[PDB]
Symmetry: C3
Subunit: 148 residues, 3 copies
Amino acid sequence: DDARIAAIGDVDELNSQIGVLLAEPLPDDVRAALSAIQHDLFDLGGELCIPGHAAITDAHLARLDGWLAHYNGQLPPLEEFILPGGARGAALAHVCRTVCRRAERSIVALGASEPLNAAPRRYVNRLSDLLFVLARVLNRAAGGADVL
Amino acid sequence: LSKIATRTGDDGTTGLGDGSRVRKDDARIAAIGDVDELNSQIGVLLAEPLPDDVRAALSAIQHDLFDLGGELCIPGHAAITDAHLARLDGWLAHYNGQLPPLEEFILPGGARGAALAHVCRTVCRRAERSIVALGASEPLNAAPRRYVNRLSDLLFVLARVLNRAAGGADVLWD
Amino acid sequence: LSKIATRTGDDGTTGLGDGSRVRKDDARIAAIGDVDELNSQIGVLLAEPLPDDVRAALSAIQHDLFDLGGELCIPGHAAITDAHLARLDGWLAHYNGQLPPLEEFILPGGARGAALAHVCRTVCRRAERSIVALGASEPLNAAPRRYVNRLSDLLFVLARVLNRAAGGADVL
Ligand SMILES: Nc1ncnc2c1ncn2[C@@H]1O[C@H](COP(=O)(O)OP(=O)(O)OP(=O)(O)O)[C@@H](O)[C@H]1O
Ligand SMILES: Nc1ncnc2c1ncn2[C@@H]1O[C@H](COP(=O)(O)OP(=O)(O)OP(=O)(O)O)[C@@H](O)[C@H]1O
Ligand SMILES: [Mg+2]
Ligand SMILES: [Mg+2]
């Protein structure tokens, strides 16, 4: 039906939102991670599209896990629920976060109607969490703080 | 086969505030998501220069949206009340009263802030559709629906307010 | 009983231009919404500095999209014609002949304007899916789908044009 084409489109939309975030000033490390993720998302979309073709591996998941641990250990503990916003960069990261979750919903729907490896949903599951973390990093880097 | 440790929702499911689990493509999770996406777009608008009063209203709205999402997360919970709807209706009367009557149809755009407000407006209307869809398959309070109904209207109004504030005007349709 | 007055759309239903009403999650309302969201994203791109011709094309497109939303609101009515499709084809030829042959795959991004154009492109394809879905349940003129299909291609080309105009470059 529409499941595959919809999932591909949402991943594309997410990747485009990340492109907008990349047009902003960013810490060099954050920029490097986001740029690499764009390539990952391009490959992810290809896996969703072509039958019998896989591209996302444990290595991709491991790298995301590594970035999560890294950036989180670079931030103070969460003291309260956060509202999406702050420096423009942080706000955009939150938009990316929500679009990534939207793509995850579509990927989950796709896997329910067609055989699909688990890597794609596990990738965006981690990515959503990382974008949340990166938003906090960007507020920090802007000399500001998260919106509570 | 995978050597990577499993994370909470790696299996495509997630939990609700009452302890129940649902698949991530569930209508309720979709509505929660659209509300979150709307709140995030408002965060982008808040990152722009804005009149103090407009910033105050939008900031308060983010809190409302956080609670609305929380209500969608905890089935049977009620965080959105008449007070919330009354405040939106008040802001609507407040800003509309200071603007000239809407003449021709307008196109979404203008000053960057007004343009962003229009994006917020459309994402808000998208959230309204998913909230309406959730309510058609699950008993839900009407407040959430009524709240976003008013919010898209207010976002439209605030877009006009922002074009004026920038010293410009609304983009008119041919 | 709520102490707040009710709006006509508070019950979750809304009206169509033909006097009928449907629930807001109806396929037709979803398509109207996505076209509106796309037009709004184009509004954000129009707030960026742009080459004069690109601004003229995008501004005209906003009027087309408003018309398209109007056609979707009035079931059966026809507002978008081949004339609109032809203009898009014209712009596609014009801007493509303004760019070097694309050799490698492109990632969405670059100068802010180009990045926004790609966001517009993805939202446009989302509206196309909604319009296509509407056709699965109701008879629908072909112009609306043909228009957004062409527009998604045009937005891709305009993104490339904007990267060059901003002294930037496409992300390979
Ligand atoms: N893809 C999604 N779209 C919208 N809302 C979501 C999505 N995934 C989770 N949520 C909601 O957000 C809350 C927490 O998000 P989180 O991503 O931590 O959940 P999870 O994916 O189940 O856990 P984990 O990240 O540890 O795998 C949950 O209460 C859930 O209702
Ligand atoms: N959530 C939505 N998404 C997309 N289109 C909508 C939505 N709600 C209404 N529309 C369409 O847009 C037009 C005007 O929107 P409006 O919000 O004024 O309608 P309503 O919600 O029925 O009325 P009210 O706002 O007074 O309750 C209507 O003709 C309707 O077809
Ligand atoms: Mg998760
Ligand atoms: Mg309404």
